[PDB]
Design an enzyme around this catalytic site. Structure first.
Site, PDB file in Angstrom:
ATOM      1  N   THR A 163      -1.078  -3.327   0.269  1.00 26.07           N
ATOM      2  CA  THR A 163      -2.166  -2.485  -0.209  1.00 26.07           C
ATOM      3  C   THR A 163      -1.776  -1.729  -1.479  1.00 26.07           C
ATOM      4  N   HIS A 215       4.885  -1.096  16.904  1.00 27.65           N
ATOM      5  CA  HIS A 215       6.096  -0.811  17.663  1.00 27.65           C
ATOM      6  C   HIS A 215       6.256  -1.566  18.970  1.00 27.65           C
TER       7      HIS A 215
END
Lengths: 242, 242, 242, 242
Positions: A163, A215
């Site tokens: 991004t 995660h």
């Protein structure tokens, strides 16, 4: 879960309405992505004193091939090789939530803010392409995005995304992963920042790199190492040749 | 979704309990807000070398009107005009999730940490009010908050909010949007930071500005531009007159 | 009352004739205005050494928005805030000659000398508009005036007016109030005038400000204070932010 | 004559109303005064470098008598003797419009802006009173004015008036004669102004003196001479002793 209670906004001020089709698709996508993935962003700054010098020297060879050498094609590569080194970054959670699909090919996409919304064109096999070929494709897919000429086929099968918004502004951000992907590479404005050379402080432009990670797959240590290595790959792009 | 499994905390140490009414209302509000909105924070630092100089020079005119010139009333304005320029910041998602209610009036609220909890008093039409009038109201609504004299009517219809906590401490934070709002303006401690003047490094106090945004509406580029323009509006407050 | 006795002007020289429609409407208006209102003008000079410096520095930001930063939009503001402070300036005499209608909104108009006559286009809610937005409207309403495209609706409901003619010339003038209004703000040529700094004389451009007032409402002291405060608001436009 | 056409002020903004009794009496008085008298103001500046020096030296003798030595008592005198010299200033138009009532006594009044309006207390026989006695009376009549303790008898029989507003501000004004009187003495702010000493420019505080006159009695030349002599009487107050 519960939502936002309806508020009569016409009681205080005046109002107007309406949205678009693409924005609704992006909205829903970003709803599912943040509802199904554990988010935490890692902030790392890479020394880009030599890279900026390189990008400015190769300006002549760029125009000869009709391309604009930006910071984008260099980043696509620094990640491209770093991804090969750390396959846990180019994976995804199986639907059985008990396995990891290890992609062997790396197709990186980049966010392109248009008038109708966000479009992330994917560059297939960026590992087998030089900066000129990559930049050529980045510029092509970006122009087709703004003109709405991007086929849906070029918006599929992305391992990771970037991004890049350094052209706009800011320092640090916390991008959100475009699932089933596991990571996104955010980049902010460059700024000549003071860096100690073990003796005295010296000015040196640094690149902001904020990366989000799932995660359930990528832990804290493995995610940081990736960024630390991206720092080293950027400071010395010759480490990509190696 | 699943929650936290009950743990017998009396097995290891000793314990005590109890909460309050307001804290429970804030808790539930922050539960719904983070469950219905895509979150990402933008970190931007504005050069406030000239503003701090202004605030200190107008100290005489402040006391004459019985007001304390803080950094709050200046921020309420820098956003007030920036909001007019970028209406996508003063909107909200329609319940039909397919439209955008564009508010034409801008009523900004500010977080006020009391003993009973968090209270965000709203300043109606901060666009039509000078720093003295704004500060007068900020101080009034803040004192009424601590004394629990704030009527529920002053806690409604807010376009955007500001979580100023520079008086306490910290560098960067990731505030959460008080929906149906779409953005919140966080601000941390000021610190004389080294800034390159194209030749040498120079000390210059910078303001930390962390803003959260709903990505179902505000994208990455549009959110950053807002902060970059807030930087420019702060460095030169004369750009607000303009 | 008696008028001017008819004089045979053909006895001495040669003659020609004729007028226009708009000029007759202005004539009659200025007849009623000076026959129903107590007139006295106040002359005040404001230090505009810093403002002229500001207007010249923001020339780049002006062209980017396609506007010409004149002294007009800055004055509209300096009065806009001064009017809020002194409501007796934005009022009018009730037809019962025993009350004062206190306007809460401030719509300031400005005299625009055209070929057909005098046209005073009104800028609605100049208190909620920045210099760029005000200047944009001042230039728009001025061009529509010269082209005769001004609708009669834009020539109504003005709290106060400004007869800016600094572009032409002169030092001081005695403008007449466009009733039912109570005050008009005249402005003449700028000139680097000698001002004592408590020790030595120094050159400093000053703005001529001649304001007429209806003494049935505004007295001598209240009218002067207004101008003295306009002086202070002009010398330091940062007092408008405050 | 025609008046101001009724305007529906509620169509554009919000409104409020009401006046007071004294303000209506002042309004009507200023209506008749400007409808029955030819007005033109004369602007003259007097060198007050020595007077200001005198007023500051006699500060000790003032406090001993419990009085505040202002610029008012000195002006009342400079006019008091100038009036004796030019009786056409202390007259009035007979109701038969063919004569002039020459007053032999000079009772000067001064404008006192209160909360309820304008009050002009008259000092009887200011020609037979020293600065201390005059100042004592100026302060007494001024305090009684603000407290509304002024009997109507002290507001009658004034030959001339003085609209001192130098304490407020401004440079020049055009006061209106409180008929049947023929002249009013306006005074503005003092300012160290550059004055050529036939060789070089020198700083010297000047007093603004704007006087209105009824031209049915006082012409252009006779009115100016009066002001020129007031200039000379102010520069050297010892010319009053003479």
């Amino acid at each position: 879960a519960a939502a936002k209670p309806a508020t009569t906004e016409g009681e205080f001020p005046e109002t107007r309405e309406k949205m678009s089709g693409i924005r609704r698709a992006i909205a829903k996508a970003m709803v599912h992505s943040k509802h199904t993935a554990p988010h935490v962003t890692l902030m790392d700054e890479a020394d880009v004193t030599k890279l900026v010098a390189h990008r400015k020297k190769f300006k002549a060879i760029a125009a000869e091939k009709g391309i604009k050498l930006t910071f984008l094609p260099y980043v696509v590569k620094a990640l491209v090789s770093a991804l090969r080194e750390y396959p846990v970054l180019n994976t995804s959670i199986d639907d059985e939530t008990e396995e990891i699909i290890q992609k062997h090919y790396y197709n990186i996409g980049i966010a392109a803010d248009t008038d109708r919304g966000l479009l992330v064109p994917v560059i297939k096999h960026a590992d087998r392409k030089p900066i000129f070929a990559l930049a050529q494709e980045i510029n092509e897919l970006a122009e087709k995005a703004r003109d709405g000429k991007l086929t849906p086929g070029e918006m599929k099968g992305a391992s990771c995304t970037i991004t890049n918004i350094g052209s706009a502004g800011g320092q640090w951000f916390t991008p959100v992963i475009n699932h089933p992907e596991v990571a996104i590479l955010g980049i902010g404005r460059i700024a000549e920042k003071p860096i100690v050379r073990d003796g005295e402080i010296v000015a040196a432009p640094m690149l902001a790199l904020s990366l989000s990670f799932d995660h359930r797959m990528i832990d804290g240590a493995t995610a940081q190492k990736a960024l630390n290595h991206i720092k080293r790959l950027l400071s010395d792009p010759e480490l990509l040749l190696m």
